[PDB]
Amino acid sequence: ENLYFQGSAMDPPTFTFNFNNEPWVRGRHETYLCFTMEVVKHHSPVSWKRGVFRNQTHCHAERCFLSWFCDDILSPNTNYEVTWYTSWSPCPECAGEVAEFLARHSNVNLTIFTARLYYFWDTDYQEGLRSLSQEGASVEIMGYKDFKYCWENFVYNDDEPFKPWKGLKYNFLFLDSKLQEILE
DNA sequence: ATTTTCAAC
Ligand SMILES: C[As](C)(=O)[O-]
Ligand SMILES: [Zn+2]
Hints:
The chain is α/β, with parallel strands linked by helices. The protein has one domain (about 1-184). About 40% of the residues lie in helices and about 25% in strands. Strands 1-3-2-4-5-6 form a six-stranded mixed sheet, with helices on both faces. Cacodylate ion (CAC) binds near residues 55, 88, 90 and 94. The protein binds one DNA strand through helix 6. Belongs to the cytidine and deoxycytidylate deaminase family.
């Protein structure tokens, strides 16, 4: 049915390590893009896809998604509601590529939730996030409900509830403030 | 378990 999953789900320790939202965490070299997609076609039942992309034919996760979407998914006369949950926000090359992809495809609507802001203090990365926002993508910080959603849908949770870590809300508030300063 | 965000010299 609509249970189609692209890629592999994370084990719990991989999720907890990668989606930790301390603004300056060390040793998180991977980029995880979880996604859900609503496929809306006028005379068909609405269908759903979800999955997980990582880095690397070499490719950052955001580009891996776009390349898979264009090559395997994107159809005529179909609307797409896409939500991303990324562990790191995009680099400027990825941000520019996603922005240009969205300009090319009016039928695709993208919402980006991000656990952390990658190089938020660098103006080239700020510009990248700004251009993403200006081309119609809503960029947001992952909060409690978003981490809980990912735990439920992209993790081998083994029916255990999401356990939020200490500092999750404080970190969210710091990051959301920095994001609003960037998008101003 | 008052079932892990917040409880802040
Ligand atoms: C967060 As990246 C370095 O895959 O654009
Ligand atoms: Zn990139």
